[PDB]
Ligand binder design. Sequence first.
Ligand code: GNP
Ligand code: V6A
Ligand code: MG
Lengths: 202, 122, 1009
Amino acid sequence: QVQFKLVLVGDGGTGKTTFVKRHLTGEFEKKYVATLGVEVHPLVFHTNRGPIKFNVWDTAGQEKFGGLRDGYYIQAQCAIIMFDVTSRVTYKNVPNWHRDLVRVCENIPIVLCGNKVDIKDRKVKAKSIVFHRKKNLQYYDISAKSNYNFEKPFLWLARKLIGDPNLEFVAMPALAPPEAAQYEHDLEVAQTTALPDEDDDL
Amino acid sequence: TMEEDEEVLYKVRAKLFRFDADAKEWKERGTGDCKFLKNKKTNKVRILMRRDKTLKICANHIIAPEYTLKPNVGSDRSWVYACTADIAEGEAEAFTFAIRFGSKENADKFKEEFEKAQEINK
Amino acid sequence: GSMEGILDFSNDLDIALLDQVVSTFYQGSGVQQKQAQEILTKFQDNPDAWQKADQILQFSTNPQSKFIALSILDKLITRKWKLLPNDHRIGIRNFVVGMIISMCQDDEVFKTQKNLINKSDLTLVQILKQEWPQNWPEFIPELIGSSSSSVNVCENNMIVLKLLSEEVFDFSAEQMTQAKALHLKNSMSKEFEQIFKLCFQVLEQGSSSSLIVATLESLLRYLHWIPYRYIYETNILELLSTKFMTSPDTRAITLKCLTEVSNLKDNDLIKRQTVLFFQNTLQQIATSVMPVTADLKATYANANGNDQSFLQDLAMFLTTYLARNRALLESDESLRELLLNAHQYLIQLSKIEERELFKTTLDYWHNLVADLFYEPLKKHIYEEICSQLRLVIIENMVRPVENDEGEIVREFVKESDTIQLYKSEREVLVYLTHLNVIDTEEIMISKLARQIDGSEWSWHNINTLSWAIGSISGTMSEDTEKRFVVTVIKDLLGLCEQKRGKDNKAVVASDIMYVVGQYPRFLKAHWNFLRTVILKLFEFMHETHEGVQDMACDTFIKIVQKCKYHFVIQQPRESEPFIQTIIRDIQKTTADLQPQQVHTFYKACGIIISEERSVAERNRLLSDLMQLPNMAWDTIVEQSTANPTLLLDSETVKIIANIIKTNVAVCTSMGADFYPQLGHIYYNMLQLYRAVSSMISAQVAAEGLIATKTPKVRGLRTIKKEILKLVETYISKARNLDDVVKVLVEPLLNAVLEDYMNNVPDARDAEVLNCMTTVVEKVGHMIPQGVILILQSVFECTLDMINKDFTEYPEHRVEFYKLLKVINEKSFAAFLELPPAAFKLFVDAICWAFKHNNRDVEVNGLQIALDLVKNIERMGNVPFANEFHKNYFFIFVSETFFVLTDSDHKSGFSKQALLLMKLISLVYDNKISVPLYQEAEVPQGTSNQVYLSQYLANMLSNAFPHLTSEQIASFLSALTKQCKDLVVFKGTLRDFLVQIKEVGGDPTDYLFA
Ligand SMILES: Nc1nc2c(ncn2[C@@H]2O[C@H](COP(=O)(O)OP(=O)(O)NP(=O)(O)O)[C@@H](O)[C@H]2O)c(=O)[nH]1
Ligand SMILES: O=C(CCn1cnc(-c2cc(C(F)(F)F)cc(C(F)(F)F)c2)n1)NNc1cnccn1
Ligand SMILES: [Mg+2]
């Protein structure tokens, strides 16, 4: 099986776990429950070069919850460094995270992501984001909330890891699908629980 | 893709939710094109829906005639229904789905197409 | 479980069991991996786990186990080193040193366990930060001597020195006190001449590529700080720019080294060497890597080996050097080929498809063309470069936000990430156009002719060209612009009459709309053509074309914002000002638009009407414009004034919301001129607000809180929110404040305040607070009793909503503190009127705001406290100010200290420090009149300065008991002395934040200033 260890680092509350959960289940988690150490999630994308599986090590950004810290980076084959464009301090800390990461992983593809561009009051201005240049990191504006560019970090990493610049995500095969006591209860509860974000476009 | 011997009866942009009964909250499962697909060999109509930009399947189940579209208290542009065999994520699993559209008119169009597909499947 | 045995420290540590849990964590999966993770973290967190590090590093079979042991040592060294007995310090040192030595003498271990060796080197560096040089003076001389005994030791000593340099010069500012940073920097500086000796001899002598790379990696770090003589008075620049450019293993790091040299700090010899290493470097690229004609776009796209990173690094080197030094290349005719060849590589790099790399080259081009714009006699040097650059930018123009069609000739989401790139492309292209307007026009006209009668027709050939044409508007003087635009428009009109189909039409229509929208000066001078454009946009408002219809609305208001005057005057050969023609047809013109687009249309009409300064004529135009919504309004207030059930018609709720949204739109652009229309609806509008509010409360009562999520109640609350938005919008722009106070404010407060107060929390609209903020902001000084009523109705009930967690009711949270801020600013007397219990809640609410991580709340809370301290100080020596200080001075001091030190509110450091400095300075200026202590507590006549120091010493002693008394006293003495110099004050606070993270911080550190 083709599988790659990916470490995700960044200040607490930048949206690392929300971003991964979006890719895992499609959900958007509004609550902030801080990661305790690391959570490991397998994540598969289908490409024209076959399936690619990322073992995503979603590490804690809060220092008091940091766990093994750089011990998580051992044998990572790629990485995402996350910050929050509404919080300047999280960009200020990007060189520290990068420092600790490349001391363990000296030659891996790394994506820098500025998350939460859906928020109107942006604080880390586009023109300010230059740290990736001397460090050969790929950069993307992203929003786990709006899905803006949300596929880009994984598409770029897969291209670098497979060694194919023409790699593309492709549509999964769609098998033909198969052809009342607890149900009326659950349906009632579901009808009477309001859908979230009723003001969104969808 | 396994969609080559199927005809596109209906397509609409939508957002799909799944009900987490334990957490008592709706969770998004995917945003993209919801398609009603009729199999040229069996004449059976399925819902098949894929996420934008990852193209991952978030709905794959027969539009069974036993299903009923019901309103959600918070929306005039959504439908709720119980699905007993969705294979988007592997083995067939039962879900309570909600699907929301860009407008009430799209939601009402989805409903009549959903019911017509149910008659085809008979 | 079996794996938790390693957590029992009474028994000896089973190293085999440790290794199994570690392997389970790294190479396992699922539940077992998660269990092992939690065990390993508990093991690492054990405060005596370090005592087992030697046993793991000696007996373990698993390098990850040894890594984890080294992480445990790192925490001990960095946080508790000076608490250890001296024998344990020496033992840890000798033990780390000897482990590094043995890994480097074993060729097999040195080659396979780089991860563990690097972590060991960094661990040693942590020891150095604690022990060197004062308790290790011979470290550098011994390192240098041991280097010549083994290639492996020598190479690893370069890694240690690299890490030490990073820790001392690159990452010290936030991890060490100012004093300790200076000590370690001075120490490295005093011994660098020896270090450089070894580094230069390795580079000139060595052949081991791995040793050379490591030496060069360490040199990269040194270049951040070493004196320039080490770089220019040696032969090292020749080695970097020739030898180490030829081999690809050293080329990457050498190029990065030469980029930093292009940043080191009248000497004609130095200029010659700066020219020379550049010439050497470019010669090596041309002969060893690729010639200047090479297709780097293709090479990058292929992405072989490290080609992408090398091209990135080459762009950085060339842009960095040329931005600083191209003047050295510009006068000497013998250097002209070098100057242009370097810029030709940059042209080739600018053709690569890589957004972030393009921004890097574009930044350089901006730097260049802005210098050619001003510097005499320079632009002619770069004529051919600039001509090629015009082509590159015109062909890589990104979408200009206003263009709403894409891909399949459809609409979407906004391309948020391209806004800045377009602006940067526009900036350079505008400069390039000024540099040679003939060349730019010739290029654009020619591309355009080959769109029509040419082999180049496509989308993104018409698109990127149309966007470039629009983007240069203003670069030509008016007469040249006139001829250019006439040519472009005819030819775009040619393309649209002949390309047919949904897709073609949408593409060309968007391009024409963008261009004409970008040339309002041309429109102002040709009224007859402006008319035809406006009428064409009205046609497009009936387009089934998704995309085109929305863009026509945006283009209409974009044009009106610039050309409004020509709609308000009466044009020659017209029967009427054109604003009249628009208004008379507004039902038909907008008939097929969506409501938000209708409101945009009305907003644009209001822009035009406000140009009319004859008040009688303006008000008549406003009445004419609002004729349809007012007649709908009159009818609906007639119907729903007898059947509050009809107000439960969803259709009727949408109509009302849209009527008010229309008023909001016109008010936005008309501002103070909107008042006559506001007065037409005001009384009935507030009656409707009350009626709608009764319905919402009734629905919540009959259906439960869930009713607030239903479409009906959301629609009813939309009415209330838009009514609040309309009033806020007018009052924020009002010029006659007397009418605001005497006509608007009393009915508004009657309508909204008790409804807010008397609704359940989930039914309260945060927009009430937002409206009240503007009310207070504009006329608060004229309504002191009205501000009191606002506080009475919203203060305590909103505070109770938001004071149980930091997450619930986030909008109420943000608007709450904006309201308190403006009241504290503008009508502070209102807080003086509060009963003591409520004033105590006010202080609680302010400190509560402190503890938010939400910047939208934290910043206002810190500001409120500062303004409040100032408000109190302005009162002078009066009973209320004396009581305030006795009750709340130390509450503000301690709460401010708490968020300064808890590591969870670093985003507010600067304003926390400002507030703390203000508080302390109050006492050391004796601006507080009464004793801050109780009569018992301390001797009579004890100064508040003495008591404050006493209070703070006690506070910090109990909050940070690992500090020594002398650390605390030295800290406070420095802090107090510095309460008039914010930058020094802040450095002392930062020194304190470092010291509380460890044991045994030097109290003399606080003398740094
Ligand atoms: N508006 C917005 N909110 C987001 C976005 N992404 C994440 N969030 C929100 O930010 C908060 C933090 O979520 P989380 O994923 O736990 O961040 P984290 O980096 O994992 N924190 P930690 O490192 O401590 O575990 C959540 O409330 C989440 O809803 C986003 O893209 N937009
Ligand atoms: O005839 C055209 C020509 C195509 N065409 C596209 N766009 C345009 C166009 C757009 C603008 C706008 F303001 F919108 F930017 C202004 C102007 C003009 F210069 F005339 F003032 C023209 N013309 N289109 N419509 C129809 C209708 N029936 C049959 C065929 N085509
Ligand atoms: Mg997390």
